[PDB]
Scaffold this motif. Structure first.
Motif, PDB file in Angstrom:
ATOM      1  N   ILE A  18      22.175 -26.723  78.367  1.00  0.00           N
ATOM      2  CA  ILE A  18      22.363 -27.699  79.465  1.00  0.00           C
ATOM      3  C   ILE A  18      22.946 -27.006  80.700  1.00  0.00           C
ATOM      4  N   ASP A  69      27.272 -35.923  72.818  1.00  0.00           N
ATOM      5  CA  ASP A  69      26.073 -36.537  72.265  1.00  0.00           C
ATOM      6  C   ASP A  69      26.419 -37.499  71.129  1.00  0.00           C
ATOM      7  N   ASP A  96      30.294 -42.851  79.660  1.00  0.00           N
ATOM      8  CA  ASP A  96      29.396 -43.529  78.736  1.00  0.00           C
ATOM      9  C   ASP A  96      27.960 -43.332  79.195  1.00  0.00           C
ATOM     10  N   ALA A  97      27.406 -42.177  78.830  1.00  0.00           N
ATOM     11  CA  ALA A  97      26.104 -41.728  79.327  1.00  0.00           C
ATOM     12  C   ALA A  97      25.520 -40.702  78.366  1.00  0.00           C
ATOM     13  N   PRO A  98      24.173 -40.583  78.319  1.00  0.00           N
ATOM     14  CA  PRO A  98      23.639 -39.574  77.421  1.00  0.00           C
ATOM     15  C   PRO A  98      23.995 -38.192  77.919  1.00  0.00           C
ATOM     16  N   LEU A  99      24.097 -37.257  76.970  1.00  0.00           N
ATOM     17  CA  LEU A  99      24.588 -35.932  77.207  1.00  0.00           C
ATOM     18  C   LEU A  99      23.817 -35.127  78.296  1.00  0.00           C
ATOM     19  N   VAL A 100      22.523 -34.859  78.071  1.00  0.00           N
ATOM     20  CA  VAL A 100      21.733 -34.059  79.021  1.00  0.00           C
ATOM     21  C   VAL A 100      21.564 -34.795  80.367  1.00  0.00           C
ATOM     22  N   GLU A 101      20.982 -35.988  80.283  1.00  0.00           N
ATOM     23  CA  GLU A 101      20.649 -36.770  81.447  1.00  0.00           C
ATOM     24  C   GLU A 101      21.851 -37.272  82.230  1.00  0.00           C
ATOM     25  N   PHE A 104      23.359 -34.136  84.131  1.00  0.00           N
ATOM     26  CA  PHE A 104      22.498 -33.679  85.205  1.00  0.00           C
ATOM     27  C   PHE A 104      22.645 -34.639  86.370  1.00  0.00           C
ATOM     28  N   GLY A 127      19.676 -42.216  80.976  1.00  0.00           N
ATOM     29  CA  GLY A 127      18.746 -41.925  79.861  1.00  0.00           C
ATOM     30  C   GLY A 127      17.244 -42.276  79.895  1.00  0.00           C
ATOM     31  N   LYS A 128      16.811 -43.163  80.791  1.00  0.00           N
ATOM     32  CA  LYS A 128      15.429 -43.660  80.705  1.00  0.00           C
ATOM     33  C   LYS A 128      14.459 -42.938  81.638  1.00  0.00           C
ATOM     34  N   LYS A 129      13.181 -43.149  81.367  1.00  0.00           N
ATOM     35  CA  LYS A 129      12.122 -42.281  81.872  1.00  0.00           C
ATOM     36  C   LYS A 129      10.993 -43.098  82.499  1.00  0.00           C
ATOM     37  N   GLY A 130      11.065 -44.429  82.384  1.00  0.00           N
ATOM     38  CA  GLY A 130       9.956 -45.316  82.750  1.00  0.00           C
ATOM     39  C   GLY A 130       8.893 -45.334  81.662  1.00  0.00           C
ATOM     40  N   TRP A 131       9.337 -45.289  80.402  1.00  0.00           N
ATOM     41  CA  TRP A 131       8.443 -45.133  79.236  1.00  0.00           C
ATOM     42  C   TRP A 131       8.383 -46.345  78.288  1.00  0.00           C
ATOM     43  N   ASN A 132       7.675 -46.170  77.168  1.00  0.00           N
ATOM     44  CA  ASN A 132       7.399 -47.195  76.153  1.00  0.00           C
ATOM     45  C   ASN A 132       6.853 -46.532  74.881  1.00  0.00           C
TER      46      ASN A 132
ATOM     47  N   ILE B  14      18.051 -25.928  74.468  1.00  0.00           N
ATOM     48  CA  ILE B  14      18.275 -27.354  74.210  1.00  0.00           C
ATOM     49  C   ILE B  14      17.393 -27.885  73.073  1.00  0.00           C
ATOM     50  N   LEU B  92       5.449 -41.970  74.017  1.00  0.00           N
ATOM     51  CA  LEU B  92       6.473 -41.568  74.978  1.00  0.00           C
ATOM     52  C   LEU B  92       7.686 -42.463  74.748  1.00  0.00           C
ATOM     53  N   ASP B  94      11.205 -44.005  75.412  1.00  0.00           N
ATOM     54  CA  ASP B  94      12.096 -44.235  76.552  1.00  0.00           C
ATOM     55  C   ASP B  94      13.520 -44.116  76.051  1.00  0.00           C
ATOM     56  N   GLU B  99      20.404 -37.746  71.836  1.00  0.00           N
ATOM     57  CA  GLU B  99      20.762 -38.938  71.066  1.00  0.00           C
ATOM     58  C   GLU B  99      19.537 -39.755  70.649  1.00  0.00           C
ATOM     59  N   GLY B 124      22.505 -43.369  72.782  1.00  0.00           N
ATOM     60  CA  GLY B 124      23.194 -42.747  73.933  1.00  0.00           C
ATOM     61  C   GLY B 124      24.357 -43.502  74.576  1.00  0.00           C
ATOM     62  N   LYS B 126      28.234 -44.778  74.010  1.00  0.00           N
ATOM     63  CA  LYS B 126      29.366 -44.299  73.216  1.00  0.00           C
ATOM     64  C   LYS B 126      30.406 -45.380  72.867  1.00  0.00           C
TER      65      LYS B 126
END
Lengths: 132, 129
Positions: A18, A69, A96-101, A104, A127-132, B14, B92, B94, B99, B124, B126
């Protein structure tokens, strides 16, 4: 403002990765990143004393942002807080957030903002990406 | 059911790190560390994703986890390059890269795909606020 990102994990590989990734992306020109994964010897696991020593070895004029994490990383981040002096707790922020994202996002917005509320909000949103 | 976890970042460290951490704690899930360029430098490599799907069995769900914008774009291009039959097994997710991946590998040990992704999607947090 003075900010550090502290990255807690079982894996030293993850936190080094990271730190290296963010720095090479030029995203941490206005923030110090500490790779704090692993036990005292690189093993998979977490040590709260890495956080404590890091805070104790740093200047008093930093805001310290703590990302973890999973598992004992999370616990180690919580137990470290209760170990600090009162002056130090006021500068210690469990994000209170995901580690990598989260990290950054915190890092890239510190190169944009003097405002810890906003630096904290961006990570918490990460944490999100606009995904599903 | 048969889920693969695919791990996408600029950073091979990573994705190697996440793979090694999942395995050292948990069996019947194949995890792919696809971080980095082809020679291992910091960057994206969509071909590695496409290769991975093509090399895999046809009876597997592929759960894609990425971190930042470039890995996300790369995972999306990968999907766009697949066959329609392959696209139907490509998810994909989301979720947060680290985590998210852990939650899914743990949960898959469930046969409900809806729930494997759901646990990943709500990973993700905590309880710190």
């Amino acid at each position: 403002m003075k900010a550090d990102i502290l990255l807690v994990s079982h894996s030293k590989m993850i936190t080094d990765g990271i730190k290296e990734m963010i720095e090479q992306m030029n995203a941490s020109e206005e923030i110090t990143i500490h790779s704090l994964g692993g036990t005292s010897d690189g093993s998979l696991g977490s040590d709260p004393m890495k956080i404590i020593d890091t805070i104790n070895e740093a200047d008093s004029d930093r805001e310290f942002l703590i990302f973890a994490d999973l598992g004992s990383a999370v616990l180690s981040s919580e137990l470290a807080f209760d170990m600090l002096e009162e002056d130090q707790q006021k500068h210690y922020h469990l994000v209170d957030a995901p580690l990598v994202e989260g990290a950054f996002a915190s890092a890239i917005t510190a190169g944009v903002s003097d405002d810890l509320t906003q630096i904290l909000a961006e990570a918490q949103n990460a944490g999100k990406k606009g995904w599903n």
